[PDB]
């Protein structure tokens, strides 16, 4: 019955993917950012310059106050508000209604984006990283506890206005090609995984693989970029620079600040390398890789000119909190968050990213010794 959830995600480039939800009685309709990188369900509950609408608790006969404040600091942006519960539904999702925790956002700083078209966030990760603490049951745990929906969901995030699918409760085989490859969820807090090797245009970076997961690696749909730990970021930019030295770019470009431009249809894709991340597999000494194309880490941005140019931002940026596999890694893959079996699956997406002479891929098996040493402690 998954066909009803196909294409239930909309989004703007660099502004996340959102699904339609309703909260309260009678149902109030809101667009909610889909975020595997956090665990709080929160919605605008008060006027804001960037909100077109918001949650009005007074109008809901089913609203319950929990008489308890809350705040969440993201890497960028944060909000605070009041906890409560209410009835929640997903129109283009499973046919159910659940009572869920809701953080009514009363104040925020750099959380809402100008003209994003969403008014809240749905954190799909585990209770452990919930605020104020792991006793606030996340939305999906409530969904699974109160209904017969199976304990898994999958995300197909499509690039170039963007769309996608959140299949709640299962896998829709019409959304990917090839085989699914699974990597263990290392610990149920973030969707934490272990990267065991990295290659750029087929050349190993040759770092201690702990560096790849320092201090963790997570799969995070709410984050736009691929984010790499300082040491890994520098090695990667150095390698991507060398491969593209044919041309030259401002260095504010490599910092994700300045756009780079080319005459429409003349982007030199061939001079940017593919990036391969190898992930720990399901069996002893076994891994698999996902390969990313430049079309994924060069994010198309709106031209600031009377020009019909193609313009892009570098969508790989530095991190001090570990690797973040954000939307530009997830785009063009079908990603299965198999909570029931503590694993995450990757397959080539039906909306896979296109290149002339190259293709995004999920390939295996590979042999990799001592994958366990790759985890940071
Ligand atoms: C567990 C928690 C305390 C929530 C936490 C703190 C720091 C970092 C993380 C990891 N996950 C984070 C990484 S991030 O802050 O870059 C984006 C964030 C989700 C988020 C929140 C508000 C946002 N506003 C605008 C955006 C951009 C998006 F829409 F493309 C956006 C994204 C993730 O959720 C979690």
Swiss-Prot record:
Expressed at high levels in the brain and pancreas. In the brain, expression is highest in the substantia nigra, locus coruleus and medulla oblongata. The active site is at residues 35, 220. Inhibited by RTN3 and RTN4. It is a single-pass type I membrane protein. Its EC number is 3.4.23.46. Disulfide bonds join 158-351, 209-374, 261-311. Changing residue 35 to N: Decreases beta-cleaved soluble APP production. The keyword Glycoprotein applies. Keywords: Acetylation, Aspartyl protease, Cell membrane, Cell projection, Cytoplasmic vesicle, Disulfide bond, Endoplasmic reticulum, Endosome, Glycoprotein, Golgi apparatus, Hydrolase, Isopeptide bond, Lipoprotein, Lysosome, Membrane, Palmitate, Phosphoprotein, Protease, Signal, Transmembrane, Transmembrane helix, Ubl conjugation, Zymogen. One of its GO terms (cellular component) is multivesicular body. It is found in: Cell membrane; Golgi apparatus, trans-Golgi network; Endoplasmic reticulum; Endosome. Induction: Up-regulated by the Ca(2+)-regulated transcription factor NFATC4. The keyword Phosphoprotein applies. Glycans are attached at residues 95, 114, 285. Changing residue 215 to N: Almost abolishes beta-cleaved soluble APP production. GO terms for biological process: amyloid fibril formation; amyloid precursor protein catabolic process; amyloid-beta formation; amyloid-beta metabolic process; cellular response to amyloid-beta; cellular response to copper ion; cellular response to manganese ion; detection of mechanical stimulus involved in sensory perception of pain. Belongs to the peptidase A1 family. DXXLL motif is required for a proper endocytosis and retrograde transport to the trans-Golgi network, as well as for regulation of lysosomal degradation. The transmembrane domain is necessary for its activity. It determines its late Golgi localization and access to its substrate, APP. Monomer. Interacts with RTN1; RTN2; RTN3 and RTN4; the interaction leads to inhibition of amyloid precursor protein processing. Interacts with SNX6. Interacts with PCSK9. Interacts with NAT8 and NAT8B. Interacts with BIN1. Interacts (via extracellular domain) with ADAM10 (via extracellular domain). Interacts with SORL1; this interaction may affect binding with APP and hence reduce APP cleavage. Interacts with NRDC AND NRG1. Responsible for the proteolytic processing of the amyloid precursor protein (APP). Cleaves at the N-terminus of the A-beta peptide sequence, between residues 671 and 672 of APP, leads to the generation and extracellular release of beta-cleaved soluble APP, and a corresponding cell-associated C-terminal fragment which is later released by gamma-secretase. Cleaves CHL1. This is Beta-secretase 1. The lineage of its organism: Eukaryota, Metazoa, Chordata, Craniata, Vertebrata. The gene is BACE1.
């Amino acid at each position: 019955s998954f066909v009803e959830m196909v294409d239930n995600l909309r989004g703007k480039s660099g502004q996340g993917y959102y699904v339609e939800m309703t909260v309260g009685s009678p149902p109030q309709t809101l667009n909610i950012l889909v975020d595997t990188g956090s665990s709080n369900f929160a919605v605008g509950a008060a006027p804001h310059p960037f909100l077109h609408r918001y949650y009005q608790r007074q109008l809901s006969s089913t609203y319950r106050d929990l008489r308890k404040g809350v705040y969440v600091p993201y890497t960028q942006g944060k909000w605070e508000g009041e906890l409560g519960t209410d009835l929640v539904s997903i129109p283009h999702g499973p046919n159910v209604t659940v009572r869920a925790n809701i953080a009514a956002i009363t104040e925020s700083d750099k959380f809402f984006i100008n003209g994003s078209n969403w008014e809240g966030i749905l954190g799909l990760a585990y209770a452990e990283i919930a605020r104020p603490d792991d006793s606030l049951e996340p939305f999906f745990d409530s969904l699974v506890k109160q209904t017969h929906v199976p304990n898994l969901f999958s995300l197909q995030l499509c690039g170039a206005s963007v769309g996608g699918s959140m299949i709640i409760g299962g896998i829709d085989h019409s959304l990917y090609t090839g085989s699914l490859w699974y990597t263990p969820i290392r610990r149920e807090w973030y969707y934490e995984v272990i990267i065991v090797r990295v290659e750029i245009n087929g050349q190993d970076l040759k770092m201690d693989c702990k560096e790849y997961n320092y201090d963790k690696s997570i799969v995070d749909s709410g984050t736009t970029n691929l984010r790499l730990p300082k040491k890994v970021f520098e090695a990667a930019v150095k390698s991507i620079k060398a491969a593209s030295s044919t041309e030259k770019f401002p260095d504010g470009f490599w910092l994700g600040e300045q756009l780079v431009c080319w005459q429409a249809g003349t982007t030199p894709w061939n001079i940017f390398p593919v990036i391969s991340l190898y992930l720990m597999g399901e069996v002893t000494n076994q891994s698999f890789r996902i390969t990313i194309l430049p079309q994924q880490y060069l994010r198309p941005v709106e031209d600031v000119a009377t020009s019909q140019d193609d313009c892009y931002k570098f969508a790989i940026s530095q991190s001090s909190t570990g690797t973040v596999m954000g939307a530009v890694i997830m785009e063009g893959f079908y990603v299965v968050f198999d909570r029931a079996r503590k694993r995450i699956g990757f397959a080539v997406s039906a909306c896979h990213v296109h290149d002339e002479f190259r293709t995004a891929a999920v390939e295996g098996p590979f042999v990799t010794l001592d994958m366990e040493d790759c985890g940071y402690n």
